[PDB]
């Protein structure tokens, strides 16, 4: 349906104008699924029209809060380091492509190229031993019988030593201040007042 000139598409052609109302939705349902720094290649569930009318990524990201503040504390640190280290770090030019250049389809060019690895981070075999196994999975545990609920992935259930290690990692990203008496005029109600 990319090539349409014919008569036989004068249904689908009208179909297209229809989905023009629904598009913005799709963008949102696309653009909250971004693979995130550490994942290599993400796989989603799209619900597509059968006229080629539009394709809604269908899922929603569910990531445990602490495990998530971990993952981003990892990448945060690896960043600061890999900024300090290398010499000329070249930000890329925008836009990525010029206008003459119709975007190259997936089945041909990109599927053979293989990913060229992400951030991750050194971690350890000693400190992090509990967490080094799974911490970088796309979604950390689609299955751990006891640790997480199950494939539908709701209600994570953890253990002290782990949750410790997470505490340890996320130290860059955490609020760190434990005394309520700190916020004195910085609570809400002193704002509303």
């Amino acid at each position: 349906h990319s090539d349409m000139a014919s008569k036989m598409y004068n249904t689908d052609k009208k179909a297209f104008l229809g989905a023009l109302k629904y598009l913005p939705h799709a963008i949102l349902k696309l653009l909250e699924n971004m693979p995130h720094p550490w994942e290599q290649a993400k796989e989603v569930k799209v619900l597509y029209h059968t006229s080629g009318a539009i394709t809604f990524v269908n899922e929603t990201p569910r990531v445990i809060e602490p495990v998530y503040t971990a993952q981003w504390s990892a990448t945060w640190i690896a960043m600061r380091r890999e900024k300090r280290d290398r010499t000329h770090f070249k930000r890329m030019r925008f836009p990525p492509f010029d206008d003459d250049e119709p975007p190259l389809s997936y089945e041909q060019h990109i599927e053979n190229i293989e990913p060229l690895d992400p951030i991750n981070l050194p971690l350890d075999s000693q400190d992090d031993e509990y967490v080094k196994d799974w911490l970088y999975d796309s979604r950390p545990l689609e299955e751990d019988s006891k640790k997480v609920n199950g494939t539908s992935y709701k209600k994570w259930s953890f253990d002290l030593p782990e949750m410790s290690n997470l505490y340890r990692l996320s130290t860059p990203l955490r609020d760190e201040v434990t005394d309520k008496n700190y916020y004195y005029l910085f609570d809400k109600k002193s704002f509303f007042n």
Binding site: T11, K14, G18, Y22, H49, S51
Partner: protein
């Protein structure tokens, strides 16, 4: 021949009311019967 009347589920993107449109008509005012208007120039055209 009996019957059962089953509406057809749309294809939600495609128009709903394929034939609806905005046109303009004038319409026949159709009646048989009348409404007798039933009521009850010398000094006045001086005045008025």
């Amino acid at each position: 021949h009996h019957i059962e009347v089953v509406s057809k589920q749309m294809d939600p993107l495609l128009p709903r009311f394929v034939g609806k449109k905005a046109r303009k008509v004038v319409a026949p005012t159709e009646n048989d019967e009348v409404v007798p208007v039933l009521h009850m120039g010398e000094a006045d055209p001086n005045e008025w």
